[PDB]
Write a protein that binds this ligand. Structure first.
Ligand SMILES: O=C(NCc1ccc(F)cc1)c1nc(N2CCCCS2(=O)=O)c2cccnc2c1O
Ligand SMILES: O=C(NCc1ccc(F)cc1)c1nc(N2CCCCS2(=O)=O)c2cccnc2c1O
Ligand SMILES: [Mg+2]
Ligand SMILES: [Mg+2]
Ligand SMILES: [Mg+2]
Ligand SMILES: [Mg+2]
Ligand SMILES: [N+]
Ligand SMILES: [N+]
Ligand SMILES: [Zn+2]
Ligand SMILES: [Zn+2]
Lengths: 368, 184, 368, 184
DNA sequence: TGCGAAATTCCATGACA
DNA sequence: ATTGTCATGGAATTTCGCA
DNA sequence: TGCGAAATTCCATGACA
DNA sequence: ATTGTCATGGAATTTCGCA
């Protein structure tokens, strides 16, 4: 502060104040003739207040804050002090956007067998049809085979009714769902425990995690729309038709329909495939097992050039779920406890809780 | 001649009337001929209408080439014939008073009747809720003639609910005594 | 049809039926032994119905439709007949998504002078503050200088009141707005004609076109949020502060604040720049003119690898504005009358009208 | 000594009372010293409060280093001094009964008074709506001493509303006669 | 042993509240 | 304590029919 | 005539209803 | 009859201080 600048005026060298410039006194203030012009060198004890005042004008970032300061002042390593304040400004930290993308998506392994993993979700509300407003959609992970049920609400009770009918056929090892009200109730947990079914939940506010069923929702809505063109949207009576239609549609990348992957033989539907007509059922089931294991599986895409990946102990911030008007889009900084996988982490959060959270709902805190 | 396959033939039949359960009185029984796989549907009547409503569910999962039945009224009506024609399903009738399926199906229908009776005693009014577990049981039951359950033959995998206890299926002395009480 | 297939059975060569395969009769139907197995060759007069029936099962595209047909049939150039039907299926054409991206964005020239072009827009509704719910935002194109006005509605009347106050200072050549109710009313058109101001409108449903002001809306909301952290959202009394704060913030790419670009000298605000202290106003205005012309201007980015660009006479489809539940997201095909620029076109539309429309709200009709 | 600049000095003053227009009675007049640029604000009173409300608008566009005024009550109050201190604005007062600006400002204030009078006759009650056009006129008026309008000096460009007619500014014989009528 | 054309595979694009 | 997916239709690449 | 470090510039990322 | 924009903060690149 006063000592440093004093020793400077009488011509001695202080580290980080370049020797070739001339430092003088004027109007009670240390100055220096720099190429851009004459700037005031404030005492070090004054610099935090200056940086802060500059920053607070419009809560600007590194350069825009620096450019204000540089108008009047010069000191050694200015940006270092600017960044110091940026990393301490609660308001900037929780309001600003990130400028670092998530690391590339995982492509989880396809469930090995039918009934290994169900993905379930609700679509709706849809226009009232026979008093119904929603559709429960159940997609078998391995096969893509889909079951559709009309409901009046996305309720636990309607979910249970529907799955009682479905599990008449078979019981799945795992049911994966998002955190919809219907699936996270303790009634639904009981229903599943009663049957030795493990409930698996998506990280919150991250529909990609139910991608298997979500993607089917698209086709479901797309076919319904086409069938309803120029008619009133009486969708109820078409659910069954849509279900059958989709279960018997080819995926061009796989060369199989979901019905085929589930049963290894077409039923009596139009354009049924006849290639296994001369095989025994046993020969057929054997070819099916071979077909199931050799299906195309996609790989993790290349990272974008400025992605980040979570590291244990990192300061990160969770996206505010439904941010109110003119309120921060981010929570206060929290710490990464565990890296479950490159796209999923446990954080010690804003409430002091462990939360399992998708990287897509996180930014790395800026300036450390 | 081509080997027998799932969906080649569904065998259908009604069971009931039964004691009312959630308002239902019958069970439509469907058995796949090749696999012995069973689907059950609760109905309020053995009518063409209830049969169509029920088979509409099943046939939104898989369509059989042939439906076999006896000459039940529900199945010989021209409405049901219309329905089947619409779906490219051939209809097949056993001659009156002479029901013929196959060994496999006969035996399955038998198990179905016996298993129902066994569980409806004590709770003759709670069968609606039990239909799911009944079907799983039936479909995960080892077939002596083939080396496999219907589940395995239908899906080509083991099941997550193997019914390792091949059961009594016979009524215990206590059940015979309270079956002669409820039917009195 | 019957003639073609006849001449085939008796061993003669017909174009497109490869010679090396053997064609026979069985069950009253022409067949052929192909590597995959024996397929029925239907008469040509039957093929449209077949393709159609296959397609209609689930309204599938090229491959998924083909794969059904191939299960039972073979004929020459099957996909040609499949594509024929696809291009004729009204329902697929108006329901399906595009799989071709828009060509790369234009970077219009910065207005040469302050007051050459205003960009205006509304933000809101915001939480009630002093009975106010919206903000009119006016951004000078050349400078970025921004004026903020609180309103109770996004109305023509409130717009007129606000711009009467603003145009006290200067009158702009052009005011660019989106198609908000407030700006497209005939009252507002009169107000502008009265002043010799030309009204310029964005293509409908394309906020990028008001990008200049939209982008300012972001900073406006971002600063307001920061200032309101842990206080009730009393934003009204902060509009003026925000206006001044932003007008005096540096753009790091330009190295100038909008105030500087408008006046060429800082007013009495914190960290005012003093570099022109020794210039006359005239010397200063001369440096300003030089500064205004030499500003960084960005260029059109590279096209994505599968973009399309409009060509006069092309069949294209306009995105449905607010599509109802389970209704097509696209209008019926329409024709490109004129290509205004690579990102903007006039179409002869679904109503028989000329519409000026952004490429972003268009897809090229598939299959021609 | 450094050359004179915009924002160096704002000269402020009230004009009125005037006939009521949309409930307003005064005009706060602000003139930039260097450029001669004029901003006008309608008020209901020549009070510290109305001055603060009005200058709050202007100072959300540009802040002057110095505000010059006479010793009006509104401008000498400790509230107004607080306001100016808050904003780093130096306050400057002409000595009582002896108003001094600059040639440029004096002349501008003159034009302002005269131009107002000219247009308020015939429509003494419609001046509120005219303030915008008044200001444009004033700010796009050629200055004999400098080669430029205030607009040009403030923004460094030509304006889109040049007032090519340097006007009468004098009252026509008809207006003198109906000015002596309205003020009777 | 190489050509033109058809068939198949590749894959960016967009949408699942 | 968990994780994107896949129909789509032009273009790129491979295969086919024939020689 | 070349080094280490600071300063400046580059620019992908995301959000404006 | 019209058209994206630009604050942001790490990384890449250039300049600076000194020799
Ligand atoms: O179906 C979804 N589709 C969107 C989607 C699907 C797939 C994909 F890749 C991207 C987007 C979906 N979205 C939900 N959200 C509602 C919006 C606020 C938070 S959210 O979590 O984003 C949601 C919430 C609760 C229950 N089920 C939900 C659900 O099913
Ligand atoms: O501010 C806008 N921000 C979004 C935005 C801004 C910039 C950018 F690049 C992307 C997106 C905005 N959006 C409007 N739309 C409402 C949603 C349905 C049709 S829409 O046209 O998309 C809108 C409509 C009417 C009037 N003003 C509008 C408007 O200002
Ligand atoms: Mg959901
Ligand atoms: Mg019978
Ligand atoms: Mg708008
Ligand atoms: Mg006075
Ligand atoms: N996995
Ligand atoms: N342009
Ligand atoms: Zn801040
Ligand atoms: Zn179609």
């Amino acid at each position: 502060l006063d000592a440093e600048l004093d020793q400077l005026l009488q011509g001695h060298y202080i580290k980080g104040y370049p020797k070739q410039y001339t430092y003088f006194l004027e109007d009670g203030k240390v100055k220096v003739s720099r190429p851009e012009g004459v700037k005031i060198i404030p005492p070090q004890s004054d610099r935090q207040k200056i940086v802060l005042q500059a920053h607070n004008l419009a809560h600007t970032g590194r350069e825009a804050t620096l450019l204000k300061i540089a108008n009047l002042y010069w000191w050694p390593n200015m940006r270092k002090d600017v960044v110091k304040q940026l990393g301490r400004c609660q308001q900037c930290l929780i309001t600003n956007a990130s400028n670092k993308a998530s690391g590339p998506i995982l492509r989880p392994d396809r469930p090995q067998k039918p009934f290994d993993k169900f993905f379930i979700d609700y679509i709706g509300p849809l226009p009232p049809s026979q008093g119904y407003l929603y559709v429960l959609v159940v997609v078998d992970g391995m096969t893509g085979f889909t079951w559709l049920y009309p409901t009046k609400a996305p309720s636990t009770s309607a979910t249970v009714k529907s799955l009682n009918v479905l599990t008449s056929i078979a019981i799945p090892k795992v049911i994966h769902s998002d955190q919809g009200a219907a699936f996270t109730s303790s009634t639904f947990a009981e229903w599943a425990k009663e049957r030795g079914i493990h409930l698996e939940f998506s990280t919150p506010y991250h529909p990609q995690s139910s991608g298997k069923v979500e993607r089917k929702n698209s086709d479901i809505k797309r076919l319904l729309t086409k069938l309803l063109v120029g008619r009133p949207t009486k969708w109820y009576d078409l659910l069954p038709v849509v279900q059958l239609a989709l279960n018997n549609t080819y995926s061009p990348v796989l060369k199989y329909t979901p019905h085929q992957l589930l049963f290894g033989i077409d039923s009596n539907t139009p354009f049924a495939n006849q290639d296994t007509l001369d095989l025994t059922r046993e020969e057929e089931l054997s070819l099916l097992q071979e077909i199931r294991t050799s299906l195309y599986h996609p790989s993790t895409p290349p990272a974008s050039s400025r992605s980040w990946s979570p590291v244990v102990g990192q300061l990160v911030q969770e996206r505010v779920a439904r941010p109110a008007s003119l309120r921060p889009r981010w929570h206060k900084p929290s710490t990464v406890l565990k890296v479950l996988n490159p796209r999923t982490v446990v954080i010690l959060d804003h409430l002091g809780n462990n939360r399992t959270v998708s990287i897509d709902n996180l930014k790395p805190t800026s300036h450390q | 001649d081509r080997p027998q396959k799932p969906f080649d033939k569904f065998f259908i039949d009604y069971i009931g009337p039964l004691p009312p359960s959630q308002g239902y009185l019958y069970v439509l029984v469907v058995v796949d001929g090749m696999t012995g796989f069973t689907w059950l549907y609760p109905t309020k009547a053995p009518s063409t209408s209830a049969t169509v409503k029920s088979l509409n569910v099943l046939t939104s999962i898989a369509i059989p080439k042939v439906i076999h039945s006896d000459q039940g009224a529900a199945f010989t009506s021209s409405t049901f014939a219309e329905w089947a024609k619409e779906r490219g399903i051939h209809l097949e009738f056993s001659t009156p008073y002479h029901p013929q399926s196959s060994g496999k199906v006969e035996r399955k229908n038998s198990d179905i009747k016996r298993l129902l009776t066994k569980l409806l005693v004590g709770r003759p009014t709670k069968w609606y809720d039990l239909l799911p577990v009944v079907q799983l049981a039936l479909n995960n039951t080892y077939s002596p003639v083939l080396k496999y359950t219907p589940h395995q033959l239908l899906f080509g995998i083991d099941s997550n609910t193997p019914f390792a206890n091949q059961d009594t299926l016979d009524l215990t002395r206590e059940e015979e005594l309270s079956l002669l009480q409820e039917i009195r």
